[PDB]
Design a protein around this ligand. Structure first.
Ligand SMILES: Nc1ncnc2c1ncn2[C@@H]1O[C@@H]2COP(=O)(O)O[C@H]2[C@H]1O
Ligand SMILES: Nc1ncnc2c1ncn2[C@@H]1O[C@@H]2COP(=O)(O)O[C@H]2[C@H]1O
Lengths: 501, 501, 501, 501
């Protein structure tokens, strides 16, 4: 799983496990018990303020048993954290384990022993010990970080407000702690003067009502909603309210920061697309191009990228050989399945040439190949129609699953015909050097291309002396296999039928 | 349109439509009816709290008819969403369609049937059913997202606060819902004790006044403006106010996040320009350059980029062949129209060479070409004046639509004269290898360049043996066309006249 | 200036001015009068709420004259904005000029004419007309944007809170408008019931006191500081307070957004440096390198970059030929001034080689050149000391302004000696291909390098057959100039003296 | 230290120190005394509001001595700041030193002298002078910035909220100043009417109580928690409360901005990783790949990068020669230590080849080398197992510390066998050109590779004519060293044993 990936492969993980055997943190038992320990810690942290407010006056079996269970869980956690191994345990104890173990203790037994050998003072001491027992927050945060690293990155694509709920729960816990403190401070001093407790007679009211009022001001101060009293009668109340206001301000600022971070991270793709389009349009405006140019460029950009951005060259370069090769194989399955030359050929040659193609998109009406120009690349029509024109020869059309541009790459001359796009056509270009290097060691493909090129040129009417001489030399050569000749004839017939259509 | 672009080309869209025919979401009927459905849903969501506040005591024809129309619209929407096709419909029903259909029901008929077979309880049940009928928020959000994807990206350049109005409307709707809840909660319990309703006697007041007060506290709590009561008398009022404060805090945080995201996205271009300029100035300060150097570099940067940034190389590389080629053709229309050699030549050659130019800008007084140095590029003066100097030959000037640097690229020797810039001159450079590869297969351009170079060198006085030998060989060669000779003579005369000026 | 740069060069600006002459926005008169117009508009916008509060009851000469001056300024601005030119003026009038001209009118004369042909109604109409006359905010914002584009980018490096003051002034103006509205609304209705005016008897108080109270609640509501009344007695007061709360919330959100944008833009350099260092340290941790490796890499990074970041290659590539060349010339002035070979040589050769150097920094103790290895570059010691060691030859030192690594680049063999760094040394590397291409056409530099190399090798003791044969061929060749021989002898003597030291 | 790095090397620092000697800011004495000066300034700024509130009525020895010490410290700081050197001192005095010196003066002596030659007026003047003496804030901020530049960047990796505490302290100081002003303003006017002082009788209360109330409203207004009075009775109180509200709003906005900046900077690595993964997945979705493809690509990305991002090529290119070389040497210590050919060879050759390796990772089951294809690179199995298969030869396995792909790179033919990955294998690839250029000048490595290749091919059964001819020529050649032959035989035996296993 995650531990195996972080360690190495299966062999490395097995070797590490054998070395450990001959208790480590990356163990299934610990990786399952940490959740139970965190749940127990959360329950204890939620119940301790309630017990402090209740002052343990009626700590009956339902509460005493819960406190004992929490203390036992904390003791077990400390014992597990205590455990080459002796030195590590000593270092952990000297660093942080001793403090956590001291914080994890059944203070109820200590209080009972002290009383066996000031009831309000005893209750205050017990409450202070219970509050100090909540020092497991560091371990809880470490476990939460481990869980986030192990599970939050497993999908990370639900598009849900989970982190928002995380800060919501954190703020709720902070507000609960603030209310507990603001209720215990009058209780710690027993509230002699007319503070809020005597102002609203909350002591004579139900415990739920007093908790509601305390939480009410806790939330009001922690939030930026000031429903607070004009002022306080006592002396320490002002200072604890400053403390509450400070922690609430910090919590609200962190809340706003997390919210804006999430908002910025949410709309990232739209942000980069808008940035790129404004960038290109602003560059185009720098040169003061006509508005028609602006519209045409915008149309091209909107039609090539479907409102999307990607460094296709960079991403394809990053990937390894088989993944990239098979991605290319899948992306052009229609091309390889349609054009008969690819099917009746070595698949090694097919993938070797396919690995060098490049995506291109052409607007309708735009000239692709002009007669008389110098040629530098092939063109495979992946999708869309195209037109081939030449004076005194009418015109013809090429559909999907075909190709052009082989004459100049073969004879090293100049472009003969002219090629236009009658629609938004998506083609695959192949550079002259890549084509030559792929085709040089595969003479069968060269012979087939020469034959189909001769057929097409005879269809047009012009005759290339170099291509004719090459064909004559090939015929005079020993490469005259009957099966190869039949395959070439079938390919030529299919190409002629497609060109006629 | 957008659906056609997302699907493919016209042929692909037609094939998909034929396959569907032989009800799909990308249909004009649905793409027009979704707006009406969303408008009806918004009207229902705005009217339901009003009816809940009114408790349906006077649900006369104007309100009963509106409720019936909303129920009919919801039923029609559910029926349309219900509809290979049977399996898809079953999956949609099992996933979300069943819940929406249950939420879209005329609960008034059910209430009437129940009463036919506790008036306050009946009113409360009707209000609860009406509130639950607002579960079409998911479909409304989906339609809003579809509309944003279809229309907000169509222009995306109005520089107007439209998203700001979006969150403003969202906050207004949230405040309306909060006020409806805060008014119905006393109504749900009938408000026995002295809550706010008995405190201000809002029941005896007009419905508009009570709505205003409820919305007043709803907005006060939803905002971070605490005008709330010191505290509440009842028990549930505190809890519902905690809920209101929480939702208001979340809404305000999201508002602030969206606002800062929009602010950051607004000033993006200035941000990147400032970052780039501070980057370059900080690098320059790292080497501890003199302040005069700082001023000169800042002037160059401010004059090359007109306070703008663009990866011209990257953007030009991304574009396809025809768009980039025609952009280059337009950007140098003055150059091709002015210099007589370009006009009386094959346009294929013109664009082939033009495709390889590079923009350059030179400060006044800066040396561009120094005598005796080794040359590596051409220079086409697109705009600005330049000076040509050489000892014992006075000096001359070159205006726009001219060029220099051909001697070294032709004879493969060293720079003869010296070239200075008397103003901020914008030139077009052409590398030696690109120039040689473009010019090698077009011997007419080479002959014309050789002739004009010989004329210029004779004007200076120095004679190049290699160039003279090449000219003599060309004269002895068979390329002695009368039209070509006349064109070369006219070009030489024009160049001499320009050099004299 | 800015207009000249935005238009072109001096010639282009002069041509545009001549074409205009044979009133344009890029004119000095308009570019100076816009500031006066904006000042007048600001004064009018600041004085209109004061007059509305005063209800024009005592509009004596000091106020009537100010109103007349503001009206005259607005009329002059409209007249100037009114003015090929007729069509442009008509289009501007149809678009926005007509609305501004209607808003810029002396409504006092219209009111006087109407009265010549309901005193409270007349005062209310005059106040409404004065408020509507403030529609010049669009022109004011356009002028402010023009000023920001013309002046804020002139320096943009004061590190002062100027934009912060901009939003502070905007918020102050918004608060003034809100207070004016909140004071005029009771005045518009004459405040029949016991609103705040009757609550505090502000009417009987001084005008300054009433303005202070109105501004007090305006600022309280516009800010997120709710000192507002528990509730309002009247009916429209609640609605106008909702409007005030909404505008204040929007203003505060925009304030926070601008503040965080400025904060993010302020610490940009530290942010990128921290990002880069965490990036490299995290990569290094990915490979699990020892802590000593971490410290050494951190030391190297902190010593090469002085806590700075810059794409030196990219920035140097962007710059043109003369700027980059002269920057390189200045950066190595110590090198060219110290080493005697550079001074007694063609400066063209000096800059040609200097243009290809690369900065490098080496830690103390790190081996730079190891004996027996294959060499690929030169090294120029710009600063710091270095040690040359070889078995059975003791060792020697090389100070600043020297070089090594020529033996392998000359004889195309293997490294002979070994080179160590005894301190943090900053050197300049020169690749073998660049060195060969620079030195091939400058045989004097090759001869000098060969002579000094022979001297150094004889100092070590080893003799290179290829170098000796080349020296013998050069001696037998015709390049035996007395001045060149004397210069070579002096350079060899200086190199020997430096090597001895 | 930091000054030495900012100046240069040890020699440069020593030269600068000698030049200064033959008082500069980069001195240890000043760099240690600045902290004491800042501590004294902070103490004075904390004590001045307390003395102003106390009105110096009981300025006994504990306070008079503290004031005298603060004045003496300020005078010493001004004297030190006062001190080629005369011109610098004059310029500093004309710029800022004079203002600071005027602000740093013992105003108590001036007041005593004035009284020797209106007790409330004298106290007010003394308080104003004490407030004006706090103008050392500029020097304090400069010292704080220097300390941040010298120490905060030393580690910058504690992951602690130190900047948060910085703004917390800044806000606390601002609140203290605001409370001091809000308490002195009634004291400045002596508070004639019933302001807050007469409202709560704070004058008759203890000084601590009055300070608590003043700080209470200072914090309430500075924060966005409005517990402020409904309104003020006096006239100037409203204006000073506007000032307090403005400064508090600015402080809170800056607090929020710093908080969100820190939040964004904290989660940077996760942000870029999420951006990159969403980018690649979105590109993959653009081509509409099957879900199995999505899962496989996600697995590959998660296994190559351990949830990490790094431009390994860029980072490795940035580093110098020795650091990069030794990093490569450490990263492949297992490879060099395991494979016997590396150990019994020149370490120069080992590092020369190691410098050109490239990391690669392959999924289980993916074909790496297919029979009949054209080869272009080597493969070194750093970790993981691999399988070698060929028809009619069963199959074999290759473990870690081995290599394949030498046949095609040697004979320049085609791949003979086939290679599969049976697990997640991490290999090191070496390009054909780099391998040839490294191996061409080290014929011993070529001979060893040829011998092991012949052994492996004979193990398979196929015989390469070119390799056999090369081996025969090498045997007939003079390279027949007994030690080299024994080493080759041992390497061949080890390779055969490994291949058998
Ligand atoms: N009638 C035709 N049938 C098939 N292919 C053609 C025809 N005319 C032109 N082509 C192809 O279109 C190409 C355009 O110009 P080229 O010189 O590249 O070589 C041409 C041929 O490959
Ligand atoms: N005694 C010496 N005096 C001057 N230069 C030397 C001496 N020894 C070595 N070098 C230089 O240091 C270089 C290190 O190895 P190279 O083979 O590059 O060639 C060497 C010489 O250029």
């Amino acid at each position: 799983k995650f531990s195996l990936r972080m360690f190495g492969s299966q062999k490395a993980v097995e070797k590490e496990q054998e070395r450990v055997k001959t208790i480590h943190p990356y163990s299934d038992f610990r990786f399952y018990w940490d959740l139970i320990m965190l749940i127990m810690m959360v329950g204890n942290l939620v119940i301790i303020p309630v017990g402090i407010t209740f002052f343990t006056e009626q700590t009956t079996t339902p509460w005493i048993i819960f406190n004992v269970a929490s203390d036992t869980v904390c003791l077990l956690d400390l014992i597990m954290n205590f455990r080459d191994p002796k030195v590590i345990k000593m270092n952990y104890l000297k660093s942080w384990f001793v403090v956590d173990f001291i914080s994890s203790i059944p203070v109820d037994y200590i209080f009972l022993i002290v009383e066996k050998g000031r009831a309000l003072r005893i209750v205050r001491f017990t409450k202070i010990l219970c509050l100090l027992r909540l020092l497991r927050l560091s371990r809880l945060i470490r476990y939460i970080h481990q869980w986030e690293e192990i599970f939050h990155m497993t999908y990370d694509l639900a598009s849900a407000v989970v982190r928002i709920f995380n800060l919501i729960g954190m703020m709720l816990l902070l507000a609960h702690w603030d209310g507990c403190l603001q209720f215990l401070v009058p209780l710690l001093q027993d509230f002699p003067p007319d503070c809020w407790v005597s102002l609203n007679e909350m002591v004579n009211d139900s415990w739920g009502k007093q908790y509601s009022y305390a939480l009410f001001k806790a939330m009001s101060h922690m939030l930026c909603i000031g429903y607070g009293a004009q002022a306080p009668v006592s002396m320490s109340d002002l200072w604890i309210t400053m403390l509450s206001m400070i922690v609430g301000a910090t919590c609200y600022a962190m809340f706003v920061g997390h919210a804006t971070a999430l908002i910025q991270s949410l709309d990232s793709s739209r942000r980069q697309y808008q940035e790129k389009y404004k960038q290109v349009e602003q560059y185009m405006s720098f040169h003061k191009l006509p508005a028609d140019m602006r519209q045409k460029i915008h149309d091209y950009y909107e039609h090539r990228y479907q409102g999307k951005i990607f460094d296709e060259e960079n991403i394809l370069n990053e990937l390894n050989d088989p993944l990239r090769e098979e991605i290319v194989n899948f992306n052009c399955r229609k091309l390889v399945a349609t054009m008969p030359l690819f099917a009746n050929a070595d698949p090694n040659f097919v993938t070797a040439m396919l690995s060098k193609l490049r995506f291109e998109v052409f607007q309708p009406g735009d000239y692709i190949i002009r007669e008389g120009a110098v040629g530098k690349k092939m063109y495979f029509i992946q999708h869309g129609v195209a037109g081939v024109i030449t004076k005194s020869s009418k015109e013809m059309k090429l559909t999907d699953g075909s190709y052009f541009g082989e004459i100049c790459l073969l004879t090293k001359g100049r472009r003969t015909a002219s090629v236009r796009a009658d629609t938004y056509c998506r083609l695959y270009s192949l550079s002259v050097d890549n084509f030559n290097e792929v085709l040089e060691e595969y003479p069968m493909m060269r012979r087939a291309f020469e034959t189909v090129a001769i057929d097409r040129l005879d269809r047009i009417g012009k005759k290339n002396s170099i291509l004719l001489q090459k064909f004559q030399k090939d015929l005079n050569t020993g490469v005259f296999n009957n099966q190869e000749n039949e395959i070439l004839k079938q390919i030529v017939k299919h190409d002629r039928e497609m060109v006629q259509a």
